[model samples]
Target: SHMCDAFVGTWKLVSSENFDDYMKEVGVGFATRKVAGMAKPNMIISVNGDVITIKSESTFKNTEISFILGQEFDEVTADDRKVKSTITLDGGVLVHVQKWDGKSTTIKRKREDDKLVVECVMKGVTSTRVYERA
Candidate 1:
């Protein structure tokens, strides 16, 4: 499908805002947060037939999440949390929703020309990160 084609490229983090607060919302400890703060993650996106995947790679840890538009899949997040997630696309934006232990985290990605902007929200904390095509 041509749905995920626009995002099928490598993206390296250029800038981030409010990341520490979002990690706190996700309940990460000092060590993990400290490590995550200093590392820049590159996001890789791929698609094949009906499957789509997103991977965040960094020196601290890597996270890979795969699923279809209408289905949910189990995932182990970067911070070592088990979650069930589903994804959807609307108006050229991709939205990911993850549920775990009665809590949820949401990420929205929108492609802006050669860059991708992602917003992650958990609890009452939200963080924004921008990635440049690589």
Candidate 2:
């Protein structure tokens, strides 16, 4: 089994770095960011065969997305933006890329001991969020 085989579990956010700035750079509205920052979110990941599903749940909003390793598909972003997205696993890192309106964002999910590190980068801003097993 590979690291991707170890991803089927729930992860609770422990800390976030520069998340507000990353959200701002991505055009998230002020009110939504304010509300979105009010709590730590839980990410539930499930891997079944070649499909990967992720659910991010929080008080403000919740998002669910599923993708295969290299297959491109339509994805509805957390802020309700529709885009073409793909996910790939490189070593212990799962990389997700989404493109819309001539812009793109990259999200990297890395597996570590008892924790998962998710980093989102868009238009030059990078935000890192750490999650622990829940």
| Displacement of the residue 104 alpha carbon in candidate 2, Å | 0.7
lDDT of each: 0.90, 0.88
Clashing pairs in 2: none
Residue-pair clash count for candidate 1: 0
Q: Which parts of model 2 have CA positions greater than 4 angstroms off?
A: none
List pairs with backbone clashes in candidate 1.
Answer: none
> Residue by residue across 103-123, what tens digits does model 1's lDDT show?
999999998878899999997
lDDT of 2 by residue, 59-88 (tens): 867889888898999988777788999888
Model 1 alpha-carbon miss at residue 65, Å: 2.3
